Amino acid sequence: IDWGALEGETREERTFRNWMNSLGVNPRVNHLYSDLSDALVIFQLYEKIKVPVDWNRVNKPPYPKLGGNMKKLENCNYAVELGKNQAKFSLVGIGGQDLNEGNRTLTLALIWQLMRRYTLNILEEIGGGQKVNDDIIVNWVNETLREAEKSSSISSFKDPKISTSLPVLDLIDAIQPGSINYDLLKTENLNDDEKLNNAKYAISMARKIGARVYALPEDLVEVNPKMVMTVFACLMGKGMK
Amino acid sequence: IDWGALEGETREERTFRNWMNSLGVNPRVNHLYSDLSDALVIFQLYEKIKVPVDWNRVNKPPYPKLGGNMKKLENCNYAVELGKNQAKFSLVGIGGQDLNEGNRTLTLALIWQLMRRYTLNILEEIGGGQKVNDDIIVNWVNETLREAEKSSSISSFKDPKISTSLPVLDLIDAIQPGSINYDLLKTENLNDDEKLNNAKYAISMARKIGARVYALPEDLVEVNPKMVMTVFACLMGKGMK
Amino acid sequence: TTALVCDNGSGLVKAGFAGDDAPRAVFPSIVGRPRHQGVMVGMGQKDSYVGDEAQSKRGILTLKYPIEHGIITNWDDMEKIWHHTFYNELRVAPEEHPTLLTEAPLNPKANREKMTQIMFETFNVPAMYVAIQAVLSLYASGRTTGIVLDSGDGVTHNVPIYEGYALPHAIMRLDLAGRDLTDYLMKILTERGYSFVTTAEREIVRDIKEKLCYVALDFENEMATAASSSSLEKSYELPDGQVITIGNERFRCPETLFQPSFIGMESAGIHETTYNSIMKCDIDIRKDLYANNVMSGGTTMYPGIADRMQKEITALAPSTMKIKIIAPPERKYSVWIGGSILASLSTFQQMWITKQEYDEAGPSIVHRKC
Ligand SMILES: Nc1ncnc2c1ncn2[C@@H]1O[C@H](COP(=O)(O)OP(=O)(O)O)[C@@H](O)[C@H]1O
Ligand SMILES: [Mg+2]
């Protein structure tokens, strides 16, 4: 869990690699554009968004020097075919070259759509149907926090209470017992570091229960609607009913 | 039955001499390229692949020093003529010199085709017709093992169960009664030596019944499709119907 | 399942399975014939020797390479070489093994047609494909962008490629190779009294070529040095215990590639045709081509070629312009190694020409799809 800026990266890049690392990925990603060239990671990702993979066609890791690039390109081409045809992505100007060559744009151009598809599959999974929206989720989170008598309601996903992440920890304690230390529950959480402490804490412990949180402390301490909604969504997640 | 590597031989060489020695050959072959120079062994082989021999033309063993090489060359030349004309082999760059002189290449160049012809004559003999293939044989072996209630089926000639050779012994007991000791039937057959024990055992006992097995333990303990198929084929062999 | 593959050069013949790194079959493209009267009985009965056997018995023979300048001329001898390859060397049948082949570019269409006929009819091969010898060198190098300068036995062709697409208008083909150099060396050795005229003696001359000759980085300084000293001379032992002494001929011969006018052959030369094949290419591409020049073939194995080429083309090219050369030890095999990489891949399960397809269209398939 070595969080930190790499050797000239970007704020989106860290979100995407943390999405990957939080998602149970077998080889630890140091950084994207050198680890995804063989595409095996993306083959692991398709299955997680419920998209089949023909592992017979998937070349195993290129061990030969001689095979090398060609096997990687077969893999990358099949990955792009999965993107376009079955799973219905838009990859107009993309082929296996751009993945194997580590083009900084088009790699991500696949990744963010994969991320959205996983999020959307989730959003279907919470409410049996098609989609959900802030109405139902804010209703139920406020019901839950009402039951535990702990703390205040979510009036919006722009609520500054989440800058401290104390609603989040109140909530993690609301669904499940006091399997959690409260000495870090510290009001007047005004030092940025302390908000970050509570935030790293909340993320780690939502993952501990099994809630599939991929967030950053920088995304709760600074309130960000889509992202914070996603945190609460994946907390709907593991256990509702 | 003194198995062992000679004084700088090759893995194919041992297969071919074991083919010969297992095949009822009158002089014990120590090693090929000094024993085949008189060619009498190959004259014994033609008859076994159903190719006539004019024993009147075949010079008897060269006992004279003076006759010696010339008689051997008459023999070798006639052997090559049998190869080319009647039995329809491809021996483009071969004559009696190469046999008598012990050329390491062309000797074998005859031998492997002879081996294939014997195998093919067999493959005709199992199924009345032209050829057979893994379909029918895997069907019938699995029927047989089903009847004896002993053990599991062959799903392929790549099945790792044959690394232990336990399907083979289950099978040898399936066709014929318990004329065989089971204390060597030992599960968790993980030591390479123990797989080899069961394998030497299986080969020896298939030969004991009369199944014309020429294999090595190194060819069952390591699964090898053509070869393992041949073992089962020659077990079709002596008694089907 | 596993495919076979063989380059069938005009000199050596190389073969093996798909997926391997190095071959298990190297014999020269020979068919020999006796040229004397036989007296001893039993001996004889062999109209033809082939390969290394014929090379060993060359003292009594006439040896005929059926191939010349990448072209097949004698199809019966060729057929026999094929048989030898499949059966006597590789120890395997053709009928249940797909096969791959190569040829120099810009060959007659009839050659391809004949190879297909021979395979599908005589050998009954289940499936087939033909490739260009240059392209496989890139797969063996693990690259896409570069120039493949194959300089083999009887032909020397040049092909630029950029990102998997070839620029066929820029292809160039020479007739210089190690063979003309063999003959030229033989012609020189007269000057020192040594006279080699026959076929087997030509093989000896080849053995000298691939053991003593090298390239001069500067031809004229090297020549004046050789003229002023004997430190450059070397001696070589012939099979009969004789000794031959050689001086300036070590470097005088392969310089022919860079001054073909020695042999009365008006042409550009290597250093010049490499440049001209790039000047035809589009301007934006020329850079990576200067910087990814590749070599291949056995005549590229003299000491001092790569350094010379860099001391060459550089002078022809602009300044501030990176000249790089790639000349690994695996030369004489990059073609075949590329073929072995090829046949292992998954995609080609489409690419193979198949028997039923030839039964429909005939030999024209190799020009339909190629
Ligand atoms: N060390 C060497 N130096 C120079 N030439 C060599 C050397 N070794 C082999 N050769 C030459 O290289 C040629 C082999 O090149 P190769 O790529 O096998 O030709 P092809 O592509 O037609 O098979 C031979 O004709 C031989 O004369
Ligand atoms: Mg060549």
Author numbering:
A (entry chain d), B (entry chain h): 385 to 625
C (entry chain H): 7 to 376
Text taken from the publication that reported this structure:
The domain structure of PLS3 encompasses the N-terminal Ca2+-binding regulatory domain (RD) and a core consisting of two actin-binding domains (ABD1 and ABD2). RD contains two EF-hands and a calmodulin-binding motif (CBM), whereas each ABD is assembled from two tandem calponin-homology (t-CH) domains. Binding of Ca2+ ions by EF-hands potently inhibits F-actin bundling, but has only a marginal effect on F-actin binding by all human isoforms, suggesting that only one of the ABD’s binding to actin is inhibited. Plastins are well recognized to stabilize parallel aligned F-actin bundles.
In the obtained cryo-EM reconstruction, the core of filamentous actin has the highest resolution, but the PLS2 CH3 and CH4 domains are both well resolved in the map. The resolution is lower the further from the helical axis, especially in the CH4 domain, and is shown with the local resolution estimation. The loop 474–483PLS3 (471–480PLS2; hereafter, PLS2 numeration is provided in parentheses) encompassing the L478P mutation makes extensive contacts with the D-loop and the 81–96 helix of actin located in subdomains 2 and 1, respectively. The side chain of L478 (L475) does not form direct contacts with actin as it points away, towards the ABD2 core. Essentially, the side chain of L478 (L475) is involved in stabilization of the loop structure by forming a hydrophobic cluster with conserved V467 (V464), F476 (F473), I481 (I478), and L497 (L494) residues. All these residues are conserved not only across ABD2 domains of different plastins/fimbrins, but also across ABDs of t-CH proteins from filamin, α-actinin, spectrin, dystrophin, and utrophin families, where they contribute to the conformational stability of the respective loop.
